[PDB]
Amino acid sequence: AEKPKLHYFNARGRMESTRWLLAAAGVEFEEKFIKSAEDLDKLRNDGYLMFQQVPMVEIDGMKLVQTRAILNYIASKYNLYGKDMKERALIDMYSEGILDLTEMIIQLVICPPDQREAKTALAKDRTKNRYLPAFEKVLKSHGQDYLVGNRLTRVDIHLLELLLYVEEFDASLLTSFPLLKAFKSRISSLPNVKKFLQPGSQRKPAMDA
Amino acid sequence: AEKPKLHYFNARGRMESTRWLLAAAGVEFEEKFIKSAEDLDKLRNDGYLMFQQVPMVEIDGMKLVQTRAILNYIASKYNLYGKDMKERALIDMYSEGILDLTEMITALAKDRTKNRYLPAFEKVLKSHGQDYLVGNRLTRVDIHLLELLLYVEEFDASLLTSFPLLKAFKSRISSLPNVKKFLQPGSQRKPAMDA
Numbered sequence: 281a282e283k284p285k286l287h288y289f290n291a292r293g294r295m296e297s298t299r300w301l302l303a304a305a306g307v308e309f310e311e312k313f314i315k316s317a318e319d320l321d322k323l324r325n326d327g328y329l330m331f332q333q334v335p336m337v338e339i340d341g342m343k344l345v346q347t348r349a350i351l352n353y354i355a356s357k358y359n360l361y362g363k364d365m366k367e368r369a370l371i372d373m374y375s376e377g378i379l380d381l382t383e384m385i386i387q388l389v390i391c392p393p394d395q396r397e398a399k400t401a402l403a404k405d406r407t408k409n410r411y412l413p414a415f416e417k418v419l420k421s422h423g424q425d426y427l428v429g430n431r432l433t434r435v436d437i438h439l440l441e442l443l444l445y446v447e448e449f450d451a452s453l454l455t456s457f458p459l460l461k462a463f464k465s466r467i468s469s470l471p472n473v474k475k476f477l478q479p480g481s482q483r484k485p486a487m488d489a
Numbered sequence: 490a491e492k493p494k495l496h497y498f499n500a501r502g503r504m505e506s507t508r509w510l511l512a513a514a515g516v517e518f519e520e521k522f523i524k525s526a527e528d529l530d531k532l533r534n535d536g537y538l539m540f541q542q543v544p545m546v547e548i549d550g551m552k553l554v555q556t557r558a559i560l561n562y563i564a565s566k567y568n569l570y571g572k573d574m575k576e577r578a579l580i581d582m583y584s585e586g587i588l589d590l591t592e593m594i595t596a597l598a599k600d601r602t603k604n605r606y607l608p609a610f611e612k613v614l615k616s617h618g619q620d621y622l623v624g625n626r627l628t629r630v631d632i633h634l635l636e637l638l639l640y641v642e643e644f645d646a647s648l649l650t651s652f653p654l655l656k657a658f659k660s661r662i663s664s665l666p667n668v669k670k671f672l673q674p675g676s677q678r679k680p681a682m683d684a
């Protein structure tokens with residue numbers, strides 16, 4: 281149809297979850313990366329970032345900014361936002377937890393090394409004692425293939441993405457969570473997901489800058 | 490009909506934008522205040538806090554945590570989430586900006602208020618001239634904006650000076666029946682909670 285246009289840096293950052301979500305829906309997208317501060321300025325001065333911030337995604341004729349507005353729109357567009365408002369309630373709740381933990385991990389490489397260590401022991405604690413139990417349970421509470429409504433939703437993709445970053449951050453943390461482990465392989469082998477895990481894709485590595 | 494039951498500290502904090510949204514929808518709600526560290530532990534152990542955190546709202550026989558999930562649900566149940574995906578994208582975009590500025594409230598946020606966020610929302614109101622931000626109908630984000638404008642006034646009523654459309658907007662939404670009721674003394678609306 282039309283190709284969405286991701287305006288971000290050449291990094292994971294706040295844009296990766298949208299790349300993932302677009303990828304899982306089988307939606308090809310292009311990116312204009314931002315390397316020069318003038319690019320960001322040329323975007324600001326041209327009236328493209330409502331709050332003068334990236335991420336920003338051109339899609340169906342909008343200059344959508346703010347991560348969550350992007351993710352919600354894409355998810356509704358390609359029926360990754362569930363069946364009804366009660367399922368979106370489960371989806372939003374799950375996604376927001378996933379976001380909290382992700383934010384905690386990606387920010388460890390940013391904080392003062394003053395506190396790297398204890399904030400690291402925090403993320404690991406939260407990973408193993410709060411968030412992973414919470415989603416291991418959800419899979420065990422209903423014993424189904426997906427998080428919500430027994431069919432693929434945006435939050436399955438979010439969780440897989442998080443499971444990938446947990447493994448990077450510390451692969452040991454996953455071993456006491458069997459369903460998530462089964463869930464990870466299940467979702468990883470969905471066609472559009474497998475395609476995105478493949479080398480050469482728009483998927484982004486952990487940056488060092 | 491069971492009232493939504495809001496589980497939070499007796500404070501503004503992360504629960505206030507929900508109190509606002511319920512009140513602007515004219516929905517009566519009840520509050521169970523976490524008073525003791527023992528109160529929160531027995532919410533966790535009863536299995537009511539999926540991520541061991543509040544805000545938690547009991548609504549329609551389920552226990553919702555995560556503010557955005559709570560707000561999204563309420564806004565959808567009561568037709569404050571706009572009319573289609575494209576209005577939700579405006580509503581989400583506006584709300585998430587409003588949520589960021591609210592978050593910031595040295596005192597750096599005066600600049601962002603005056604030079605980034607408030608110009609953005611005056612321009613929204615300039616663009617279509619209509620009474621509400623989105624779809625020429627009251628939506629949740631009108632209520633979030635009014636809420637932001639109230640806290641900006643508390644922060645520094647001089648930041649509202651240059652923004653005549655926001656000003657009329659504030660007064661205009663303040664005077665909605667359901668809104669006026671929540672602004673009245675004696676409502677569940679919360680103060681800035683000091684210490």
Ligand SMILES: N[C@@H](CCC(=O)N[C@@H](CS)C(=O)NCC(=O)O)C(=O)O
Nearest residue numbers: 380502503541542543544555556557
């Ligand atoms: N993203 C969550 C954050 C919730 C949150 O930070 N809750 C605090 C209360 S204001 C809490 O229960 N903290 C206890 C803890 O984190 O251990 C939301 O928006 O609801």
